[PDB]
């Protein structure tokens, strides 16, 4: 009966079998990574069927199978929402995870704890599937925290390195700052709508007030690393390259945008929250592209690229185009995962060397990675008829013809230009010049795992945009007629970015050297935000926590008030009472005084 | 194994007990300096420089390579504040005040520009979108028993 | 109720007539059996109560506390088996006798149909704990810690006896059922204000309320492992249970009386969470975390709403289990290092991986990771406080963030990094310690499957 | 790292350190090899002009404006080797380093595996046990009165002697044990 | 001439920019020599107790004991009530409580006034 629900639950259920077998014998052998990769591929090919059914008909279902608890009039049950977003995102996430795991079978070959690493990846995937398909706020919170904990564990994979632990704690801190707003939204919805279920929230909120939407926006900004809470994402590159390719590139970091998409019926009825979302997205994308333009670590550059793409996604949310933001999420998954794959291949081939100043001519020395990275860069820059076209071009067109801020539109255009610019920077400094790596050449691509994993996402980043765009039903009014210069604006700014970046990069060959300016120093240190906001607030909280909260109040004044005062007073009274010389003279003099007082004061 | 006289004591007031305290903490008398004798109970404990542990020499052969400390050396009062996992005081290429001005200036400018863009929006030379059935009255909220004031759209 | 009480009493002659080398085995087996008997009490009704007799009753507020109390004794025996190896048989039997007497007093306290009996047993629990702290304690500050623990409690609870005898002289009864059915409003009067204070302060001082929490770090740091376990798990919840039982007669006076205590708890959770960030001792850090959790429980009880009460019950149970596990882990480290300092032994995950897994799970549970019952209580109390006032969300979020911060700080400082070079006496973890951690942690994840068992009478 | 530090740095050592830092940061600024070679030769030419200067005061006044110039143009993101104290893999493998004494706690079923390795380990233990008793007296007799003046240790001077305090330098786990 | 670097509390002065290192005197050299002498004595003691095959325990560190004792137990006996301590204690221990009391009291008085006036619109507010 109606195989939609059975298949959708079966995929999530079979994703958990290797976790149960992690205590079996296969976990102690070297076949465990292949086992998990096979399980993920089977889950993907199984989940491909409900998407096909939705494409044919549009099937939509809610599954409330298990009832966990009921508090008075509020009923909490394990409910799964299997709408367009879920049945479209699950195949993409499973495909990317399968590719990344096949890549990790090669990349992490010498790591002693690879079974554990693979197990962790599976755990993260399970948590993300819980987050995506959740129907009420409690389950989505469960996934929200599970992905964060898996991020913490995978970032600090090399727990002997201090910086990895610091980056993991930084990610936890920023995600908790977002969790504050998440909890605020949950409390508001439970107090006013009397439910955490999405259906009741949609019924009882025709004009959603500012508070729950502001809480949701804070949570989305925290988990998607917007300008206020951005620095944790670039610092999350301390983990292994497959972790940065899976979690912090294409699957985990789109969780805030997905949360804002899930609550879009309430988002469109509020105009101030939409404005705040638009401004946040614009400032985030501009600032992150400006940071990316001048970085030397390739992983840092690509992470800032991911942050800028998330900013563009939240701009799309701000202009009231949620389905377009979902499409951009799906496209960015493909091409950004492939970009991280190429970067990791380059890093491994050069003896774990990440800086681009020490990599030269790789266009011919290793051509498959070169062509994959070129295709990914073209896709990232919205080249026509490429995966990035069908999302980014529509984003630019929709922002250009909407009643929005002029500043936000200008920032978005500059961000697109800077995107083309740092893509040019990556290509130029990684593939074109003369070699700059140490003489002992160990360059090698001839491994079937790496080639197959990269080429699957290559085919995806070439054709998935066309396929998905032509297979989904329409969900928004099109921009049929446009001014000719306004139609070409994305291409014009992108080509300007290529030309300016290439021209400025070609001057590095000239035999002249000058000290850097103030703008370069501002862009290189990421606007000095990490320095100031990681040295001033942390110091001021820790110093207070030690001096006032711990010493001054607790160890001194609270101790002085009750116990020390009581002890001092009692000891003084004891000394006064017991200090008697033992002379009956004074004793009976006091008795005489006492006797007189009793006679004259009590009658 | 540590004796009574090897524990921290009260603020030193005479040069002789100052030298005794300096000897106790395994440092020179000329390098010894207690905290000011204020109300807070620092007592007799050296006021080490407020330099962080991140900026210690990473090439010295410390007994504790992770914390960059030597066995028997006096420990800074705020050691757990500077553990390379927390606030550090490493000198930066750009000065603190210049960094603050640049960071603050950029943020203030971005905010004021966003406000200006709010004051001066951008749009297209078109009229409002038109919806057929009384601005979609029945499908937006409902209330079918009120007979709202009809709105009819202008064809040009 | 006697089917639980009588076997606990028979634990004493069995212990004193046991062989010199069979006290631990017999005590553990019979304590586990007693715990199984206690499980039957959980079945509860939506109606009044399980009124066994005129002396004792059971309720869905008392049942989880009784189950936890009965379950804790085998764990305390397992923890105490190690450091009492070189002790004479008579003194080990005396230690087991103290633990059994404490369990018996707690069991009779939680049923307690009549309030003076509740007070008598609530004070009788004070003696065995004091003897355990001041007799089998390692440091020289155990005497001062015991003095603080005794005198704070007695100063708080002496006016409660006067309040109770006055209430019985006026109303005529102290049976909880009659008190509930014949409740009458309290007029806003100075005498009523002082009666409210005398009824409330005794339970406030044992929570501990912020500013009256000084005794707790001393008592927890200087106590042996079993004493720390019981103090953190059960003895702190006596104040919450008493407040839940006694706030029925304090209405409508509680609406404005609660403000001083609400402000103190709301600011003190932030204060103690921040204190946890700068701490050089594991036990002190765990104790201050307990103070923060109990302050939030105080807020829940003072708000006095059904969601507040359910969250407070769930958080009490979850905190008891989590604090017991954390103290046990700290004791396992201490028995190897003999220092009790965070920064000395580092990078223990490399040497002890399974114990590092236990550390991670305990820290995650203390961090209130969903869907653990810790977060269930936390979220219910947060929602109730938000309904009380929308401005509480700032303080609650700050507390959550700082809590995650110091929990992961404690995990990272001890488990990650580079091992200390000169420490070479770190032997592999024994099966006893691993079983102790497993028996601490598995009930939490089983209880998260049936949260209605710990949500109290207002579920 | 291996060499014991001195009480201070002389002028010549400080000049060498500045020269190395300036060359490294110039290489970081000048990515391409030919440009770096040109500017490094120009840097050497500018650097050795004051080689033959004699008086101490002008020499000390120099290297100071040089350090200030270096700090002004120090390339706030210099290139760092991956294993360096600032590199991307500085302490990546420190979690795989297990001490040697951990093998003393292995179960006999585990020690049944690798019997030759444990026999060699026992031989090393015997050698250390004798050598330590020799080394204590050797260091006691060789140390100057009043305590050491530097943290430099003497080598072995007899036939069967071993260098003092050798056990924890010879038995390092490895650079990449796993 | 180049723009000067200005140090701060959280961005200290670089070692190579210290005028103190350039002011060399025989007293400074003797001070450095005796500093390294005491450091070498401490290192010798630590390594002697570290490389001993007989030791099978933790090397007790008097510096760590002194640090913990001063941080925890040496505070109150050295405490002296001064205007600074009194004022800081009063502020940091009383001000936040009254501030939060005022905030919450005002918020709740406003909410109660709105409820009594009936203009709050508490529809669907069932769980509290
Ligand atoms: C409406 C008409 C539409 C058409 C518009 C016109 C068409 C285009 C016109 C061209 C306009 C400019 C384009 C060139 C960009 C500049 C490139 C350049 O020269 O850099 C070298 C030069 C110095 O380089 P260097 O020091 O020698 O570095 C050493 C090596 O080169 C180290 O090199 P490296 O190898 O390490 O790395 C190289 C990297 C390193 O280079 C850098 O350092 C980057 C810094 C400059 C690039 C940033 C430009 C983005 C602008 C966004 C700013 C938003 C406002 C921010 C407000 C700040 C508030 C304080 O450079 C690059 O990779 C390329 C940089 C970007 C070029 C490619 C894209 C540019 C096109 C997009 C821009 C505009 C078109 C928008 C499209 C839409 C149409 C409207 O940089 C500059 O001097 C900056 C120039 C402009 C900065 C203006 C901001 C100054 C603010 C001062 C204070 C003002 C008062 C504020 C008061 C506030 C009170 C509250
Ligand atoms: C997600 C579904 C899973 C289904 C599979 C069933 C798994 C059964 C687990 C039972 C509970 C675990 C017991 C705790 C101690 C672990 C014992 C141990 O030492 O393992 C040695 C054993 C042998 O390894 P070894 O090489 O000899 O030892 C070397 C070291 O130990 C090194 O070992 P390691 O490096 O591999 O680390 C040990 C491992 C194991 O240690 C742990 O940390 C596991 C415990 C994590 C929970 C922490 C508290 C947070 C609150 C959760 C409370 C919910 C519980 C639900 C009911 C539980 C029933 C008992 O830690 C982790 O892997 C990281 C955990 C972080 C996960 C964060 C996500 C939690 C929230 C997810 C939502 C759950 C409900 C879904 C609701 C919506 C969908 C229906 O390894 C294992 O078997 C690992 C255990 C399996 C991983 C569990 C992860 C998720 C399962 C949570 C409870 C079941 C959820 C029910 C939903 C089913 C659908
Ligand atoms: C529970 C949860 C959390 C709670 C947090 C816990 C916080 C609670 C503890 C708060 C404790 C703060 C107050 C401590 C008492 C101050 C006096 C003292 O400690 O004696 C030591 C000490 C007596 O020693 P002494 O040998 O006479 O003179 C030593 C001084 O160095 C010689 O000083 P001087 O001769 O220069 O003094 C001249 C001048 C000080 O001139 C000034 O600059 C300060 C004037 C402002 O003094 C005045 O004019 C008095 C006004 O008193 C002082 O030295 C300072 C006294 C002035 C401090 C003002 C008091 C602070 C205001 C707090 C009142 C707010 C609430 C009060 C509630 C009362 C109704 C229930
Ligand atoms: C130290 C660490 C923390 C320990 C625990 C602290 C918690 C205890 C605090 C007690 C709670 C408040 C006590 C009384 C509250 C009643 C409200 C009253 O105080 O406010 C005004 C009262 O006005 C004035 O406050 C009168 C009292 C003034 C004298 C009290 C001393 C003030 C500071 C003392 C604090 C000391 C606490 C520690 C003791 C050792 C209201 O004006 P009024 O309408 O007329 O009175 C209404 C009550 N009626 C109806 C019965 C008449
Ligand atoms: C496995 C191999 C054996 C195969 C044979 C069994 C085939 C299925 C037949 C099972 C019988 C049906 C059944 O399970 O009974 C229903 C029963 C529920 O009990 P009820 O009383 O009916 O309602 C719940 C409240 N009382 O369903 C089940 O328990 C089985 C499936 C439960 C759902 C899966 C739970 C997994 C997650 C665990 C809980 C996680 C924490 C809670 C999250 C909260 C989210 C809001
Ligand atoms: C509110 C937040 C209040 C501030 C919390 C203070 C917490 C102090 C305790 C933290 C422990 C110390 C610590 O973490 O160390 C700092 C640690 C290490 O420094 P690294 O840069 O990683 O350098 C490592 C390489 N050498 O860095 C950090 O993680 C500190 C992070 C502090 C963030 C504070 C800034 C947050 C401000 C948010 C403002 C934006 C609001 C959101 C806008 C949303 C709009 C809808
Ligand atoms: C951690 C230490 C905390 C110690 C406890 C602090 C609070 C103590 C509570 C006040 C003490 C007295 C309790 C009252 C006993 C209940 C009896 C009662 O309520 O009846 C009242 C009796 O009320 C009183 O008599 C109260 C007099 C108070 C005298 C004792 C003062 C003790 C200290 C008071 C100030 C501190 C209280 C709060 C302390 C804050 C925490 C330190 C009315 O008496 P009637 O005359 O019969 O009826 C009136 C109509 N004819």
mmCIF file of N, CA, C and O in Angstrom, chain B residues 13-20 29:
data_model
loop_
_atom_site.group_PDB
_atom_site.id
_atom_site.type_symbol
_atom_site.label_atom_id
_atom_site.label_comp_id
_atom_site.label_asym_id
_atom_site.label_seq_id
_atom_site.Cartn_x
_atom_site.Cartn_y
_atom_site.Cartn_z
ATOM 1 N N UNK B 13 56.434 42.676 53.977
ATOM 2 C CA UNK B 13 56.608 44.080 54.323
ATOM 3 C C UNK B 13 58.054 44.471 54.586
ATOM 4 O O UNK B 13 58.391 45.650 54.464
ATOM 5 N N UNK B 14 58.924 43.506 54.944
ATOM 6 C CA UNK B 14 60.334 43.766 55.185
ATOM 7 C C UNK B 14 61.185 43.192 54.058
ATOM 8 O O UNK B 14 60.788 42.223 53.404
ATOM 9 N N UNK B 15 62.355 43.782 53.795
ATOM 10 C CA UNK B 15 63.229 43.231 52.745
ATOM 11 C C UNK B 15 63.671 41.803 53.009
ATOM 12 O O UNK B 15 63.846 41.033 52.057
ATOM 13 N N UNK B 16 63.865 41.428 54.274
ATOM 14 C CA UNK B 16 64.318 40.076 54.586
ATOM 15 C C UNK B 16 63.264 39.043 54.210
ATOM 16 O O UNK B 16 63.569 38.029 53.567
ATOM 17 N N UNK B 17 62.008 39.291 54.582
ATOM 18 C CA UNK B 17 60.948 38.366 54.199
ATOM 19 C C UNK B 17 60.624 38.473 52.715
ATOM 20 O O UNK B 17 60.160 37.500 52.115
ATOM 21 N N UNK B 18 60.888 39.628 52.099
ATOM 22 C CA UNK B 18 60.803 39.722 50.644
ATOM 23 C C UNK B 18 61.791 38.773 49.978
ATOM 24 O O UNK B 18 61.436 38.045 49.041
ATOM 25 N N UNK B 19 63.035 38.754 50.462
ATOM 26 C CA UNK B 19 64.029 37.831 49.930
ATOM 27 C C UNK B 19 63.650 36.383 50.219
ATOM 28 O O UNK B 19 63.868 35.501 49.383
ATOM 29 N N UNK B 20 63.098 36.121 51.406
ATOM 30 C CA UNK B 20 62.658 34.766 51.730
ATOM 31 C C UNK B 20 61.562 34.297 50.779
ATOM 32 O O UNK B 20 61.588 33.156 50.302
ATOM 33 N N UNK B 29 65.556 37.906 43.763
ATOM 34 C CA UNK B 29 64.914 38.957 44.549
ATOM 35 C C UNK B 29 64.615 40.165 43.673
ATOM 36 O O UNK B 29 63.564 40.805 43.805
#
